Design a protein around this ligand. Structure first.
Ligand code: W4D
Lengths: 57, 616, 339
């Protein structure tokens, strides 16, 4: 009844008490990751049939 | 024309069919002749924790059938100091002290009634019901039982199933024939009525009543009644399959042999009495007891024939005036008169009198009126010609009373009172039942359209087809049962060894959640189906199922008619439809049930599942 | 009362959490990525068609070798394929016909699955002597098993319709940790790269970040207006995507503790059933109930391409670890390898 209600606020306090970074920071890190691995993505840049296991290997 | 048992896979369908009707119990299977035969087979050959119990049970059954006390005195001792005895009382489950004390009590005092070891019987069953019976259900003997039960529950007789021979009697509606059933070879009598002349003379009231009375009577294997085994009909014929009696009736033999003596009459009367006690115990009145309805067999023994005019007084007493004149009791003849089995004890006296004199005791001087005998039955009291004996009179005096309150067999004990008459003092009724007495007369061998049927009249004979389970199983047991099992056994081992070579060897219906499986035909193509909680898979021979039908894909399951054959019609979502055809009626019933339960349950379930159900 | 402020106090933290998140919303992912070139039109072709399942396909999961993949179907079977040859390595009839999910152990030694039977079954592939049989039946959930993922050969995480998730010790066969918090059926879950965290998506329209060891909920993400059917981690593990019945995918960043972007189009009205990133995380592939698989620009939120090769719902998909191909499972009983 109230033991669960007591349970809820304790959870919210644990979720409220966290360090948050700026979205500008987090968004840049994501973009930086994509750029640093764009060359390793076969779905992004279609690879030669020689290196494609589903075409000619 | 030979009997072909369905493959053991029929168990999957049959077991669910029987359990639905609660037919899968120890008592219900044990009570059946084929059921018992297969059960004893399993117990005597594939389970020794019950072998000695079955051996002892059969020894008691042999003992029960011994006639003379001379035999039972010796056998009772042999059975007691038998060492099947101290093989049971010297092992897992011995007989109770209270049971043994009763047996050795009667056995010691030198009285050996046929029901001597009855206390042992019940304790044996109390030991067979349960764990032992559960092991039987799991055995392949119950599987074979399902194979036989499938054949029985799928009996559809036609004139092609019988080899009809010479005529052996005629009636107002049809004829009687000597025939031989094709699959077993059992000699039967085929009473073929004709709906044309039936509807004409207003006879379906009798044709139906005879079929119902035969049902109430054709149980117990009574040696003194022409009992029915099967009942079926063609487009124009009503057919009863009855006991074969190719010896003519008594009215024929009476007029050709002359009047019978008291000794010759005592024979027929004795057998006729047992035939009456049979019906009366099953609350059935014959009402039409006359010399013409008494058939003789090849050996001269007799049976009561034509139950067309019989009645049931189990819950509702009869009243109307029915029967042949001169043989009708005052009670019945009196209408509005609740009159029961007391009407046959009167007809017996009238009939026996005609065997002695040559006519009814109320039809004097060739009179041909029909108020006729009704005057003398109610008013006058028939008074013997003193040619009879003091005992013969003492019988007919009691049988031909007008008072049911003072008539022989109507003052509490029924037939037991008639058997007790001084006229039958010389007879052993046990040996009368066994037909041990010599018949007085042994029959010489080899002698003795502008109407339309509407469908509504054909709807009177809707539930006419019937099959006495006791009769059919008995017929099978005493003919083809053992040999058919032998062939079927090796034919199944043959398929198994072949599947060994080919390599599988592993059942598709095991280790899963399969609900049921078996053969069906789609559209025709015959495939093996597997019913799961969410789909219906099927396959041909030579590979596991490549096709199926999801339960969610099924809309309805309706029974439809095609070529006079019942089929299951499956309506599928895409406006399509799927039609199935079962090999037997039991399979049609179970598949329609299991399929309806399956798709309704599945669709009910899928709707509650986010990932499974259909979204906008 | 004493339930007086415990509901008011609870509301205030929700305001503060929302306030703390707004304080971090200094810019958008869309604004940050306006300088990088678009991925252009993404176009793939079917390299393989896996035929075998007799009914609907509900789930699939790639092996770590980017060659073997397992799939669960309505026909009550698990099939382990060789995507290169399309040959079947294993066909595993299940004890229950109501399977909804399946998983492939990173070692390749085991595959797991479950459904309406409310249990997660572990299957040993490299066997005792030759065959393939049930090695463990994880019982505990009071609801159906919606998803499961191997941490290793003796640890697996599961989500259920019983509202909860759970960490299992396969050897002992009991639940090491229970993750309670959701208020609706948990539909999917995804393991972080470090396998020290994992996110879940339930029918309460919320995703939760869990600590595997401490067994606690660390962060809660909302925004969706309906059931979350699928969820997946971004390659670096600092973010994850979600698929909902609201016809929208969404990107959530952990360190920012909020949503970064929404992937949708006015033409797309059907629900998402599965989500997955390309190797670089630049592409967000999602399966839809309109028989299609839309490819989204994860950074710019544009629809780059569309995989249209099924005649029924795309119920699942997955990108290989080497990023060489995408597999799509459908209600048409077919799996296709796109490239
Ligand atoms: O039932 C019989 C009958 C039975 C047998 C018989 C029984 N078993 N074997 C042979 C023999 C002669 C018969 N003659 C006449 N009826 C009455 C009847 C006949 C037909 C239609 C209606 C009533």
């Amino acid at each position: 009844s109230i033991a669960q209600a007591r349970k809820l606020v304790e959870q919210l306090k644990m979720e409220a008490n966290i360090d948050r970074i700026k979205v500008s920071k987090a968004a840049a890190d994501l973009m930086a990751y994509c750029e640093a691995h764009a060359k390793e993505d076969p779905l992004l840049t279609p690879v030669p049939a020689s290196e494609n296991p589903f075409r000619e290997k | 024309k030979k009997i072909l048992l369905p493959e053991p896979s029929i168990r999957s369908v049959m077991q669910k069919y029987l359990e639905d009707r609660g037919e899968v119990t120890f008592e219900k299977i044990f009570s059946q002749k084929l059921g018992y035969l297969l059960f004893r087979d399993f117990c005597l050959n594939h389970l020794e924790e019950a072998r000695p119990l079955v051996e002892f049970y059969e020894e008691i059954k042999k003992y029960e059938k011994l006639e003379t006390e001379e035999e039972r005195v010796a056998r009772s001792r042999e059975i007691f100091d038998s060492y099947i005895m101290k093989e049971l009382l010297a092992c897992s489950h011995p007989f109770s002290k209270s049971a043994t004390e009763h047996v050795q009590g009667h056995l010691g005092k030198k009285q050996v009634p046929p029901d001597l070891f009855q206390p042992y019987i019940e304790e044996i069953c109390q030991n067979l019901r349960g764990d032992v019976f559960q092991k039987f259900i799991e055995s392949d003997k119950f599987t074979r039982f399902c194979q036989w039960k499938n054949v029985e529950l799928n009996i559809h007789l036609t004139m092609n199933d019988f080899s009809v021979h010479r005529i052996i009697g005629r009636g107002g509606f049809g004829e009687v024939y000597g025939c031989r059933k094709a699959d077993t070879g059992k000699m039967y009598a085929m009473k073929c009525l004709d709906k044309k002349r039936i509807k004409m003379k207003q006879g379906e009231t009798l044709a139906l009543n005879e079929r119902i009375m035969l049902s109430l009577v054709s149980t117990g294997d009574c040696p003194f009644i022409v009992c029915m085994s099967y009942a079926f009909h063609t487009p124009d014929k009503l057919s009863f399959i009855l006991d074969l009696m190719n010896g003519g009736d008594l009215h024929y033999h009476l007029s050709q042999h002359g009047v019978f003596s008291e000794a010759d009459m005592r024979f027929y009367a004795a057998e006729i009495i047992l035939g009456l006690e049979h019906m009366h115990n099953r609350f059935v009145v014959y009402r039409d007891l006359k010399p013409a309805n008494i058939l003789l067999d090849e050996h001269g023994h007799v049976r009561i024939s034509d139950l067309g005019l019989a009645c049931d007084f189990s819950k509702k007493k009869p009243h109307a005036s029915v029967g042949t004149h001169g043989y009708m009791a005052p009670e019945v003849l009196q209408k509005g008169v609740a009159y029961d089995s007391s009407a046959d004890w009167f007809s017996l006296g009238c009939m026996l009198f005609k065997l002695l004199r040559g006519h009814s005791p109320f039809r004097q001087h060739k009179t041909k009126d029909k108020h006729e005998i009704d005057r003398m039955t109610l008013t006058m009291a028939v008074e013997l010609p003193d040619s009879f004996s003091p005992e013969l009179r003492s019988l007919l005096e009691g049988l031909l009373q007008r008072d049911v309150n003072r008539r022989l067999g109507c003052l509490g004990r029924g037939a037991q009172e008639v058997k007790e008459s001084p006229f039958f003092r010389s007879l052993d009724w046990q040996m009368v039942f066994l037909q041990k007495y010599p018949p007085p007369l042994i029959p010489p061998r080899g002698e003795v359209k502008g109407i339309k049927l509407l469908d509504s009249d054909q709807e009177l004979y809707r539930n006419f087809p019937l099959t006495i389970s006791e009769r059919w199983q008995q017929e099978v047991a005493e003919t083809v049962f053992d040999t058919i099992n032998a062939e079927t056994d090796r034919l199944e081992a043959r398929k198994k060894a072949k599947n060994k070579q080919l390599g599988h060897e592993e059942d598709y219906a095991l280790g899963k959640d399969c609900i049921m499986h078996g053969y069906m035909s789609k559209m025709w193509q015959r495939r093996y189906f597997y019913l799961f909680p969410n789909r219906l898979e099927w396959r041909g021979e030579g590979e596991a199922p490549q096709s199926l039908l999801t339960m969610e894909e099924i809309q309805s399951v309706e029974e439809t008619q095609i070529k006079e054959r019942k089929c299951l019609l499956l309506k599928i979502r895409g406006g399509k439809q799927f039609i199935l055809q079962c090999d037997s009626d039991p399979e049609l019933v179970q598949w329609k049930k299991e399929l309806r339960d399956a798709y309704r349950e599945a669709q009910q379930l899928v709707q509650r599942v986010p990932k499974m159900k259909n979204k906008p | 009362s004493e339930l007086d402020q415990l509901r008011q106090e609870a509301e205030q933290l929700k305001n503060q959490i929302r306030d703390a998140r707004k304080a971090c919303a200094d810019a958008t992912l869309s604004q940050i990525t306006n300088n990088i070139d678009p991925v252009g039109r993404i176009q793939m072709r079917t390299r393989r068609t896996l035929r075998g399942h007799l009914a609907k396909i509900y789930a699939m999961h790639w092996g770590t070798d980017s060659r073997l993949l397992v799939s669960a179907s309505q026909d009550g079977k698990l099939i382990i394929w060789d995507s290169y040859t399309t040959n079947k390595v294993h066909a595993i009839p299940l004890r229950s016909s109501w399977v909804m999910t399946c998983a492939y152990a990173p070692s390749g030694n085991y595959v797991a699955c479950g459904g309406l039977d409310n249990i997660c079954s572990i299957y040993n592939l490299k066997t005792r002597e030759g065959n393939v049989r049930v090695s463990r039946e994880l019982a505990g959930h009071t609801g159906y098993l919606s998803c499961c993922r191997f941490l290793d050969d003796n640890q697996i995480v599961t989500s259920s319709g019983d509202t909860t998730c759970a960490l299992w010790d396969i050897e002992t066969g009991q639940q090491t940790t229970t993750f309670t918090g959701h208020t609706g059926d948990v539909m999917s879950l995804s393991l972080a790269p470090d396998t020290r965290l994992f996110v879940s998506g339930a029918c309460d329209a919320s995703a939760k970040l869990w600590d595997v060891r401490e067994g606690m909920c660390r962060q809660t993400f909302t925004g969706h207006e309906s059931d979350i059917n699928a969820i997946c981690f971004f390659p670096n593990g600092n973010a994850f995507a979600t698929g909902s019945d609201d016809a929208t995918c969404r990107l959530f960043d952990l360190r920012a503790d909020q949503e970064l972007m929404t992937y949708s189009h006015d033409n797309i009205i059907c629900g998402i059933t599965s989500v997955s990133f390309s190797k670089s995380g630049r592409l967000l592939l999602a399966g839809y109930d309109d028989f299609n698989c839309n490819v989204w620009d994860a950074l710019k939120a544009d629809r780059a391409g569309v995989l249209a090769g099924h005649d029924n719902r795309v119920s699942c998909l997955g990108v290989t670890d080497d990023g060489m191909a995408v597999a799509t499972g459908s209600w048409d009983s077919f799996l296709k390898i796109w490239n």
